[PDB]
Design a protein around this ligand. Sequence first.
Ligand SMILES: OC[C@H]1O[C@@H](O[C@H]2[C@H](O)[C@@H](O)[C@H](O[C@H]3[C@H](O)[C@@H](O)[C@H](O[C@H]4[C@H](O)[C@@H](O)[C@H](O)O[C@@H]4CO)O[C@@H]3CO)O[C@@H]2CO)[C@H](O)[C@@H](O)[C@@H]1O
Length: 409
Amino acid sequence: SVKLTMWIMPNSDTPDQDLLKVVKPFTDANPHITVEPTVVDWSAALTKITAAATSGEAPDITQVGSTWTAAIGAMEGALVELTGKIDTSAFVESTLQSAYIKGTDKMFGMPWFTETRALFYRKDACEKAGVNPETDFATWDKFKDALKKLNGIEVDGKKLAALGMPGKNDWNVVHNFSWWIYGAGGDFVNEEGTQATFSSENALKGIKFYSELAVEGLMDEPSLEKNTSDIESAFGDGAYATAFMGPWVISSYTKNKEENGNDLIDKIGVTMVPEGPAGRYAFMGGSNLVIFNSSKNKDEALELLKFFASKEAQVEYSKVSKMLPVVKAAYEDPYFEDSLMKVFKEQVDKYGKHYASVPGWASAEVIFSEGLSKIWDNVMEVDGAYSYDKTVQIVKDVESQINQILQET
Ligand SMILES: OC[C@H]1O[C@@H](O[C@H]2[C@H](O)[C@@H](O)[C@H](O[C@H]3[C@H](O)[C@@H](O)[C@H](O[C@H]4[C@H](O)[C@@H](O)[C@H](O)O[C@@H]4CO)O[C@@H]3CO)O[C@@H]2CO)[C@H](O)[C@@H](O)[C@@H]1O
């Protein structure tokens, strides 16, 4: 028989077991094929995938962050070109842009799932504070005014910080600035994807508006030293009135109720990100699946990728991971009438914006994580009083290095 190996990032509570439950229909129908998943944590995934593409010590298949697909596909001989091998008509068209290398008609990944970051809020905090979450989060200015009412609000003894967000030590550092830059009227690169432009007046206005929510005491500053995992868990413990998070947190908050009696899940709602002066824009992320060119079982691997794109496999993986399907027909399933999931779907569809799918973007994210986190060091005044001018200089320095990276293509 054929033993297909696959790498997956931690997309659900028990990643390997949950993947195996989703692929069981495939292996039942193909008893001569087995699937063996291996988990690779997000922090190491880019290094391990890059090394596997070069060395040939690689699985047949790997999950790849959507923002990294062009980086891997652009490596000569790294991935199987999938152009014309997958029926793209079943996919939500917008999810295909990250599967192609910008500037080419070459498809090197298959969209697997998508995700966006939405605004979670505590319903009990909002009522006690006189905040109507149906209208008071709709714009930047109403949002900031709501945070002032929410900051220091007491909810059953606990004093809550208005907004809680991470600041360091993972890939989300740039993701969490993204829609603030877009909403201000900026972008990270030019239309060609060849020149960094996030030091523009508009991009800086978004960076300034967001970072100075913390300077004004509305965003919890101790949390800016932490990563996404820490802040997701803190919100689940009732530490903040609001937070921007992906849909996967619904899984952990649900488990917290079922296992520990924590009913935070029943006290929260979700709404779209507030509208900025450019209009509403949201982060569009997700993951693709790729076949390594060193695979000795490419026919079987392609069969597995096609199964992962089937309606039922898309629905079942969404139920366990809370990620959004990339296949249109999956949204016909009754599961998608869930009020929370509908917000993420509506947001990504109407307003989701994905980074340019250029080969240098993966390298830029490494620079972003190190560089933009220094904005929070400025805000936290670990080395002198906050200065907007320091933030500007940080952004310009990061932009200069991003430019050198882009010019390697
Ligand atoms: O930039 C690269 C890439 O990023 C993608 O976005 C990723 C984030 O980078 C990543 O931090 C995030 O990780 C989630 C994970 O999906 C959840 O499953 C996980 O849930 C935990 C839970 O907190 C624990 O309580 C429990 O024990 O286990 C599970 C899993 O271990 O929580 C983390 C966040 O802390 O996932 C994002 C989406 O994949 C972008 O989508 C992509 O576009 C980028 O290319």
